[PDB]
Ligand binder design. Structure first.
Ligand SMILES: [Ca+2]
Ligand SMILES: [Ca+2]
Ligand SMILES: [Ca+2]
Ligand SMILES: [Ca+2]
Ligand SMILES: [Ca+2]
Ligand SMILES: [Ca+2]
Ligand SMILES: [Ca+2]
Ligand SMILES: [Ca+2]
Lengths: 433, 433, 432, 433
């Protein structure tokens, strides 16, 4: 399928960003086997085609802020003049309560560094979930907060504010009515996201009472006042939280969210999803359910280039890792695990050779099958994966294919071996004419 | 004590060494879930009492030799004038064949460094399993090899050798008879260990045709000639290999070996064991089978001093880890996991308080019970383990015991929680009067 | 001004344009070298041709597990937002030169060895690769000293299909030198492949030493080549010169190196750049070393975070980096300074200033913000606090003695009472 | 001049400790070119003979305490049952004031870990310069403080305390009279050191007003009360501080201190010194001035074992460094720099060959001369140092000596090259028969 878009790790709280005709999504990371929020670092993924997502690994950690105690929660990255500002909530060590920090990088992949050495903003309590938006006039605005929605106008430097922290009036006209809660007069729960289309500003937000849904408000200007719009997406699935990120890419609008749809998924082991966001003619948004996502890619993938093992459309029983020597790589966790890429254009001439960086800890009996169409589709080639000792050691295997491959294909790599776990590790692949 | 003596890791190829009235055993490390030999680094454990073993973690890695390809196999550390020489077999990258290197350190725990930058010795083939022995006259001897037993006279510097590589005559007189195996004329397989008692030198060795047993030879000189002695220990258990280390400690002789007796144990997931070695009055060794090991501690453990969580007699469902912040620590893998230490002397006054450095990733419901005698014995105290976020973050918990503890006790630490895995992590403990 | 980088010894410049920013990858001569001591590669970037951002080390010889050392002249090329860095290193396997290739997903890396072995290794002289992707999408690699070699690379950019071609070392193609049968032509090493209109150019260091820069032209990227002439004679304190040529925003630039920094030499070099002029027929007249770009092609915005290591001209400053703050600069002695050119404060102007700074000295350490030159009027003084070492930092906010308006050159002068290591400086910004 | 004992780095605040018949000194480290106290990490050096000192490198840093802001000041390590407790003063980040922490390790070289994650003790102000002493009955005592001398009884576990922080009565019968300062009523300034000899306890301490001298007090009990003894050593030389460490080794007592006697030395670039401490028959101490140290080694150095380049008696124009590959090594900063080792026993047969691990960044012209007696003494051999590229690359050079060397010698290694700086680097050496 196409949702969740990442299956190699538990991801949540998606925050998209476009730079130079590429779509990135920054995410939080739920540790495996969590029964509570175990969130320590932030990830970024990217796509050129909306069906294949490249895993770029960790780009920031809570410990990159020397004053942070933990809790790497929902963040957002925005770009301006080739610099990338990543706004993050963390619990501070100084007073043991939430705060918003900011790191800055010169690429979407970083490296990102704490430029303040202290919080950008810390209130009385409830300093989580920042969203930042740069308007057409160049003015930058930040909203955040749980339980209270707060607002500040950011300076041009993007790393300070002047003025006060504005507590947005929690009105039933602005955010709807919840009943039976005085800490929470409205449906607003947390996680604001500020977006613009035509002449209208949108504030998307998780709403309560739990399990969370996604609601929205509208306004004529970025600073409010806000107008309740309705429910964008009702509560659904195994994750009691949902968290929105909305963005335009190549003339369409996309709605990122998360759920608990992976094996072992839950409210503490979530997974990021995406589907198209459709507007009515007046600019309102119809209620939508969780769908299977993007069914058709908007561009082809070139198989005659180095393509990462961690550029994945759909997979099962594969996890992602990284190290300093090769970067991000994937490991097959059991026999018959697979990765797939969609909309691969082998062209008219066709591919006759194939190369891959691979390895295994097992002595014999490890293969990777290149198949077309599905995990049981026709076999184009089989790679014998050599013993390397561990994922710090790798070999490149070049094979001639049983038959030249042409045209548009979906390519499946199936990993086979005699062991019960850790069948092999896979870094990148390529085809040759 | 009980066997295996290490249950928090798969360990093999034990190599004991005495320094300053403490007994150390250096071991290889079988990675979890191995179906082939996956061995990357070397460990050292130590004891003061023969029943409680301290895990000192990794003290050397194959990659600490820049010319090594992998295969961190059976090693031995010897001491001379406060310097420690660890002889290791590794496969070389230069020629893709085995070689013997040597690292030197200034404590039993290192740090250890490759002092040559190249092999100490490399022959034509089968350069594995070194043993090194310093005679009463101060002369050092090295044996090694599979299939051919090889010998060199080491120089005083211990990191070079004099003369030629001697191939020891593989005669039935020296090592017994194996049935038509052109390549293996004798029972000798690999893994020599040179030991001295009274006026007699012993060479212990794994023998084939396999499953492996332990045989021995004797001589009047450390260079030989060697005369076949008999079977020290027949093949037994789930490991097709066995590997001996013999040494005197406080007037008794101990026989270290390995088997496959841990859960998930096998020939590639082995576990180190020890039992006493008894001699006949003429110096020969009566054959023995694998026993429970050490029944009685030769010294008490002081509970009023800092004692490591990784100082363990017997345990279940505990694994050991390390990092640079706290060193070695242990993790409980499921509810009802436990560690135990034997022969703890609380004295006549007794313990009234307890302290422990611990943490968990779970939110509530995590306790560690201190019990006496067994994992089901009387509860002396309970520790509430707080949420810290991950094993990079820790708290110290101080509790007053309801029951004062006196006299000699066996202390069990039982780890309890509501989650199905990774209950908590544990670094050290101590009692107060 | 030239050299364009003064905070380290840099050499073998290899420019590259990505998304309207101009990068230059360089090699790194260690301080106090009496021989080639070259271990890692750097990348700098500009928006304006007068201020250069130091992005730090982006690759090391040791990132190739098979390399013994000698991180020499490299080039990075981009294709569909992936970046391929072709590097010469000495291999441990046979103790001779080889070309490797690393790949990254931004100009700043991270870059990883994707082969685990050389991309190419011949019998001898495997140094100084240049790579060019033609209009038809096909990529060409040249390299070599003493023999110019060529292969055509596949699209994957990390392999080649045909044979290693030894380009004929003829006078019609590379000029004539007499003596040295092993060097029949002026060609010495360091080829650079560039295209302008209908003509391909191969620039190269020429001998005998001290090196000059010559060029050849061709109608195809694969040759055959025809000698053009001398682009730049030998001059100054570096017996090597190494060319990189590129178009940026409608002009052509010639990167090279010399030994013009204090302590400079043939083993402590410094990268330079000046505009490259062509004749109407596409030939190149001889040019000498100039003072470089006299005017910036864009303004610098002082109201955004600006790195201390974004520098036009400086004295007695060195660059460093760590994982906590990234790249930063240290003032090595009193009267060290950095400067940035063509800064647009606008009509209203700046009233406040912030810098991340620190020092190891107890009192007496200041950084002066001055306009126009290092002796120009003082807009503000920053008292730099004791932090203990460049692992610890403080942000200092000041109000300016007067508002700053219009286009300015900004000088940051570092002062203290000690003999060395006055302070360290990470970034700054102004506020309205 | 055998003082200072360490010339390859600026060292201060010596704290000796004996373990298994070897003498260690833990020191603070003054960064080069300091005009203020720039102190970040702790060092340990060791000797077998009182004339040659081995550099063991950094064994702990301020940053190994996650709560420390900086100022790695005067520390002391004590041993008990093969565990080593290192008490350090650092400034806490929580409140920006001084605190005492404690790290624990399992060898004198570490690794050492903060076992509390917080201060062992923090008072209102003055938390520097701890000394710890374990008495004959096994109870441990801690003194510290500036300006106020403070005391606590440590628990058996050595990482906690009993009762209250005791402010020792700052009396003139106990610590003499100053006059002029209300916060300094007595000569006591800081830096206490608790020592025992026969039935008398001694507390040594820096005294003021500055420049600091060393005075002492006596008692019959470790906890006091204290009786002023007199001045042990008046202020002298270029360091306005002095800091005492006193200890017995092989039947003599040694007084460690520091001064500013190296090139570039000062109050912020200090150097550790040692000389013998003499007592009168009644246990009082005659006043002494700075001497040039130990004139004769109490044991010979064996040149036929691996000997570190950083085992040095006297040197000029040499600095010490370290990395993970080789450990500690030395660099000659200019032509004619040298190291020296004293009392080296080549024996009756003698050395005929020499080996050394070395390298240089220069292309040709680099030699290392082995000389006897002095840096201009007879040349036994010359080693051509090869180009390696940097101190991350090394070669071993073996040479035949021009003449055999026999008997007791002082060995000088002189580093020569044509360059103006950084001639070469040197890791270890050894002779062969
Ligand atoms: Ca968000
Ligand atoms: Ca990869
Ligand atoms: Ca062995
Ligand atoms: Ca521990
Ligand atoms: Ca080049
Ligand atoms: Ca910076
Ligand atoms: Ca002291
Ligand atoms: Ca050394």
């Amino acid at each position: 399928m196409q949702n969740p878009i990442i299956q190699t790790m538990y991801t949540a709280d998606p925050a998209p960003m476009v730079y130079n005709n590429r779509l990135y999504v920054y995410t939080t990371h739920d540790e495996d086997q969590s029964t509570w929020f175990n969130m320590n670092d932030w990830k970024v993924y990217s796509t050129n085609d909306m069906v294949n997502w490249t895993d770029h690994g960790t780009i920031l950690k809570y410990s990159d802020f020397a004053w942070a105690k933990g809790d790497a929660w929902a963040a957002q990255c925005v770009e301006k003049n080739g610099k990338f500002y990543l706004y993050v909530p963390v619990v501070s060590k100084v007073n043991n309560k939430g705060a918003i920090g900011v790191a800055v990088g010169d690429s979407p992949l970083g490296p990102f560094y704490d430029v303040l050495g202290k919080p950008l903003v810390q209130s009385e309590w409830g300093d989580i979930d920042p969203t930042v938006f740069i308007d057409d006039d160049g003015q930058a605005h930040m909203y955040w907060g749980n339980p209270k929605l707060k607002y500040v106008k950011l300076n041009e430097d993007m790393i300070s504010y002047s003025g006060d922290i504005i507590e947005v009036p929690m009105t039933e006209e602005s955010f709807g009515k919840r009943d039976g809660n005085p800490e929470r007069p409205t449906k607003y729960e947390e996680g604001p996201w500020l977006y613009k289309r035509k002449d209208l500003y949108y504030l998307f937000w998780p709403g309560g009472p739990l399990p969370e849904f996604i609601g929205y408000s509208t306004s004529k200007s970025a600073k409010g006042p806000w107008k309740y719009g309705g429910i964008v997406m009702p509560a659904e699935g195994k994750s009691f939280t949902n968290h929105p990120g909305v963005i335009d890419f190549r003339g369409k609008t996309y709605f990122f969210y998360h759920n608990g749809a992976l094996p072992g998924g839950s409210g503490f082991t979530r997974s990021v999803c995406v589907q198209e966001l459709n507007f009515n003619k007046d600019g309102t948004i119809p209620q939508m359910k969780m769908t299977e996502g993007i069914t058709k890619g908007i561009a082809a993938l070139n198989p005659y280039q180095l393509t990462q093992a961690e550029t994945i459309s759909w997979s099962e029983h594969v996890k992602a890792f990284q190290n300093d020597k090769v970067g991000v790589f994937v490991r097959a966790l059991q026999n018959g695990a697979y990765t797939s890429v969609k909309n691969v254009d082998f062209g008219d001439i066709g591919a006759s050779a194939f190369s891959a960086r691979v390895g295994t800890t097992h002595n014999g009996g490890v293969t990777m099958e290149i198949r077309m169409g599905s995990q049981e589709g026709p076999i184009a080639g089989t790679v014998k994966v050599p013993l390397t000792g561990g994922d710090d050691r790798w070999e490149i295997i070049n094979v001639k294919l049983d038959r030249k491959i042409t045209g548009i294909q979906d390519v499946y790599f199936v990993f086979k071996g005699k062991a019960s776990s850790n069948i092999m590790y896979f870094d990148y692949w390529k085809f040759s004419k």
